[PDB]
Amino acid sequence: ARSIKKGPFVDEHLMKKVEAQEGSEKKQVIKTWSRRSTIFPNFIGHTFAVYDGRKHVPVYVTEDMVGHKLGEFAPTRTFKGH
Amino acid sequence: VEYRGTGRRKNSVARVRLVPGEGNITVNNRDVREYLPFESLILDLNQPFDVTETKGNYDVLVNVHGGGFTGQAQAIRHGIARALLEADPEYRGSLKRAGLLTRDPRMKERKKPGLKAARRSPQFSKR
Amino acid sequence: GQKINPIGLRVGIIRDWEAKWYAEKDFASLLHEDLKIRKFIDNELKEASVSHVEIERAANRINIAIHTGKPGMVIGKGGSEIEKLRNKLNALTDKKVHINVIEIKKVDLDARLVAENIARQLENRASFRRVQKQAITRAMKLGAKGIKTQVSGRLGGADIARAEQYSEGTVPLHTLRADIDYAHAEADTTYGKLGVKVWIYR
Amino acid sequence: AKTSMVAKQQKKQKYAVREYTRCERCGRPHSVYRKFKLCRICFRELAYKGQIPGVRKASW
Amino acid sequence: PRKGSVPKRDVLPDPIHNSKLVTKLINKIMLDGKRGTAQRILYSAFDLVEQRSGRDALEVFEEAINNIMPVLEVKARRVGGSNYQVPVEVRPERRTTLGLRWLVNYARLRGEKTMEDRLANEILDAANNTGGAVKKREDTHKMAEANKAFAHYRW
Amino acid sequence: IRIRLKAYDHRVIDQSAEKIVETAKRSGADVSGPIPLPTEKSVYTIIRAVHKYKDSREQFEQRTHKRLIDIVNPTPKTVDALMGLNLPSGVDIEIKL
Amino acid sequence: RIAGVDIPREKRVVISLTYIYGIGTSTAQKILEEANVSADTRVKDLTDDELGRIREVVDGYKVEGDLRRETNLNIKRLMEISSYRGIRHRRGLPVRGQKTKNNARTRKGPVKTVAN
RNA sequence: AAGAACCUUACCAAAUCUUGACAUCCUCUAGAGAUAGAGGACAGGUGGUG
RNA sequence: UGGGCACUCUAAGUUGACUGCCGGUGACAAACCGGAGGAAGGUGGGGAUGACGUCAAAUCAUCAUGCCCCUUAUGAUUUGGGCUACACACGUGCUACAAUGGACAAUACAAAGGGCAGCGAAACCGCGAGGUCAAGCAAAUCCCAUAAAGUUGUUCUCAGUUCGGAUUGUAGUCUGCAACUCGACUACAUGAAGCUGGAAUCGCUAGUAAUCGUAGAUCAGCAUGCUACGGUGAAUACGU
């Protein structure tokens, strides 16, 4: 995954709508389609409505989640047993 | 006084140069017992040296390339017989009796399509 | 799947290639230029009895040798018609000034011409048996060692596909030292497509 | 569907990992060779007539 | 098979002991085309049985082979609900094939540490009329002894 | 001086092996014999069927035959007669020079 | 015995020391470079002064307990934040992304068959 | 199918369009991105019936 | 390496294997058995080559096509997801359950291919994937590239083990806008089932069965699949 020279990956438009509102106090429910963006340290206290394919499941970002892409936190398939 | 007798086995070609002298067998400028891993190859190599009595009487300067070691050993053996006639052409009366002047055509098989690799077939079940 | 294609089997052995040029690189574009020319020739020279089209290439120049059973129809009244063919091809990519017309004297001895002649009559509500027998009769009258003809699919407008095959003389399709001209044509009728195959051996 | 995916393949995509190869003669997106830009089907038909230079049946 | 007989592939004499029998024993020990090991297995056992018995390595081997080779086999005929076990005397060529096979198989089935010691152990036991190799022929003879009543059903 | 030719057909490369040594000897010049270079066989394996019938493969080849002819004494009448290449539109010519 | 985990005696140091959890063969070979032990002496033929040198090196690495605790909190963290890896941990399924359709037994466990 | 992260994908969920994705004649700015702003007979259909 | 081109290779042409021959069994003749050269003997061995027809076998999703429908949709462009989901059953393979072995070091012997913005040497760094600079080669010239099984020694001493490497944790490499769904790999940690498989079953009479690696097509990346290439390499096949 990536490299050390390339570093972390966040979609070119995604962080723009993160450092857009951080000068304000309230977090938002920004609708998201990029599941491949790394959850950056500046992603803290921010609901990301990530598209699972049909819906925008919201996710409050805690410190531990920094490092994995928000796609890991958006379940795409559904299964209730057999 | 090089008696040039060619010899081919599988994918190997040996340039046998019979020269007079009692000594070892020098495969690619190396002793036969350092070149060939096993002695059984060295026995098959000296088959025409034994069928007609010339054992060790020549220092075979052989330049073999291709194949493994068994293919190279019999390519030398075939080349030796084709070179024993180069020294004395009245030697075939026992070489044909023991089948040493014939190029062995038992070369590998094609990978037959539809069948698993060579002549064998894959697993077969019934639906 | 029973019969190997007669042309493909004998190509290189007794037959020769139509596209005769070398291209270590740019092979894909050069080859597709050949088909682009051939496809344009197919509809432009449709009513002309065109049998083979050879494309040769040398010194950034495309040589086309068109074997036709109706010379003059392609050439024109001295060259006017062939000039339009040359410049229309000329407008495509490079220059291809060389166009050679070769007369096919025995039209009924060419598989592609016989198959096309059969297919056009079949489209005009003709007997699928009379067209085969008459064409076969002409070729054998012309000295051919043997001719084989086959028409397939909804013969006469029926609801079930059939295959009427008639043969005369010797047509050995298993011998390789023999030039058997083979060609397939289609006849689009109201009831569907037809399949014409001809095996003329001389 | 055809005539839209063919034009899309002809159309230059954004990146260098989006383009793919289609048989220019028929439009098949699978098993297309690079030396001829033809699918395994179109290769057979054209090689049988002899319209591909130097290509003949192999019988080794 | 149906059409006549099949010529057999021959072997050359052993490099050391000069015995075609010895080389064919290598052909039985060999698995997956590995001649190297098989050649080492036998010479590490021929030279080993010399230290156990004392006599020549090939001399004990010849004695042992004779005590494994079967004299009377039991081929199967059929009349109906009863299958006729017809005792047939073993032709000389099949005897050596069976004796060599029973030496290897009943050496593999035993075990102390390795294959060389197992082979050497079975070689000495056979010359002493002991071991599985000689117990296989004793059962082969026994079945031929019991079914002498079917002798005249030999096709 | 290294004139080399590549051809798909062995007959036009044998004819190209000749016909230029003869225009080399047309002038006063020594030319090396046609060197038989290893041909390059490209093998293609395709499924005959238009769908699912595998294990039925049609195999095709394409052999590029190669030759090497070396002019040993290049005279002016050879460089002027070097354009007399009778290429049948399918024989690639590579004069290293 | 090293730091509570007894290693098999009558075994070579390089081989016996891998019996400790958290230490493998490549790590074990590292001890014998620092501690001057010939990697061939049996633990039963080992000298007490050699034991001290070995034991000093061992605790430097993440040897026992800590590695067990570390690996668990790593998975526990994956459980808490409900990622793709960690939810599959709950359900006992291959978390890397292997095919669970027909061949997954070291994660599914016993084959509890359903009749047809 | 001799090559499923996008493509391939022909499947699904959103953002969309309707002379059209294609014939044939008549450098910045938002925005997931498409795309947007600024510097008419006809087509098409991996739709059905081997 | 100068020089030769001798040998060998390379690729064009050209000999040879035709029951010519010698017997003997059939002289109803074909034929059949043995023998002689000869490299090859009885269609020398393999490949391509698949008749009439059969199965309304397969393909309207390669393509075309009669008819039937959609035609602000059954058409069309984008992002995301899915095609990889998992109670399980089936077919086809791979890996092992070690001592003819594991490991540890040295030490050999191929074939066939591919390569231009590709193959990418040599050097340097890194445990290693790999990275930095790079010569040469449009290639019998340079690169992939090193075959490995194999040989020689040392170590283990039958143990779920110095067998086995599934599965997890951590830190990384490459490609790609982007490896979470869902890539290949590399290190360190872990260490599953598995002690040679029941009833049944398939393949094969030579360079075959078995065994070891190499190459190519596709291809940014991705094969235990497929197609090809060689190395080692059994044996009874009496008999119907």
From Swiss-Prot, chain B:
One of its GO terms (cellular component) is cytosolic small ribosomal subunit. Residues 108-127 have a biased composition (Basic residues). Residues 96-127 are annotated as: Disordered. It comes from the Bacteria. SUPFAM superfamilies: Ribosomal protein S5 domain 2-like (SSF54211). The keyword Acyltransferase does not apply. NCBIfam families: PRK00132.1. This is Small ribosomal subunit protein uS9. It comes from Staphylococcus aureus (strain MW2). The lineage of its organism: Bacteria, Bacillati, Bacillota, Bacilli, Bacillales.
UniProtKB/Swiss-Prot annotation, chain C:
GO terms for biological process: translation. The keyword Transcription does not apply. It holds the Pfam family KH_2. InterPro entries: KH_dom, KH_dom-like_a/b, KH_dom_type_2, KH_sf_prok-type, Ribosomal_S3_C_sf, Ribosomal_uS3_bac-typ, Ribosomal_uS3_C, Ribosomal_uS3_CS. PROSITE patterns: KH_TYPE_2, RIBOSOMAL_S3. Keywords: Ribonucleoprotein, Ribosomal protein, RNA-binding, rRNA-binding. One of its GO terms (molecular function) is mRNA binding. HAMAP family: Ribosomal_uS3_B (MF_01309_B). NCBIfam families: rpsC_bact (TIGR01009). Part of the 30S ribosomal subunit. Forms a tight complex with proteins S10 and S14. Belongs to the universal ribosomal protein uS3 family. This is Small ribosomal subunit protein uS3.
UniProtKB/Swiss-Prot annotation, chain E:
Keywords: Ribonucleoprotein, Ribosomal protein, RNA-binding, rRNA-binding, tRNA-binding. GO terms for biological process: translation. Disulfide bonds: none annotated. GO terms for cellular component: small ribosomal subunit. GO terms for molecular function: rRNA binding; structural constituent of ribosome; tRNA binding. Part of the 30S ribosomal subunit. Contacts proteins S9 and S11. Belongs to the universal ribosomal protein uS7 family. PANTHER family: RIBOSOMAL PROTEIN S7 (PTHR11205). One of the primary rRNA binding proteins, it binds directly to 16S rRNA where it nucleates assembly of the head domain of the 30S subunit. Is located at the subunit interface close to the decoding center, probably blocks exit of the E-site tRNA. This is Small ribosomal subunit protein uS7. It comes from Staphylococcus aureus (strain MW2).
Swiss-Prot record, chain G:
Residues 89-116 are annotated as: Disordered. InterPro entries: Rbsml_uS13_C (IPR027437), Ribosomal_uS13 (IPR001892), Ribosomal_uS13-like_H2TH (IPR010979), Ribosomal_uS13_bac-type (IPR019980), Ribosomal_uS13_CS (IPR018269). One of its GO terms (biological process) is translation. Keywords: Ribonucleoprotein, Ribosomal protein, RNA-binding, rRNA-binding, tRNA-binding. One of its GO terms (molecular function) is tRNA binding. It comes from the Bacteria. Belongs to the universal ribosomal protein uS13 family. Located at the top of the head of the 30S subunit, it contacts several helices of the 16S rRNA. In the 70S ribosome it contacts the 23S rRNA (bridge B1a) and protein L5 of the 50S subunit (bridge B1b), connecting the 2 subunits; these bridges are implicated in subunit movement. Contacts the tRNAs in the A and P-sites. Part of the 30S ribosomal subunit. Forms a loose heterodimer with protein S19. Forms two bridges to the 50S subunit in the 70S ribosome. This is Small ribosomal subunit protein uS13. The lineage of its organism: Bacteria, Bacillati, Bacillota, Bacilli, Bacillales.
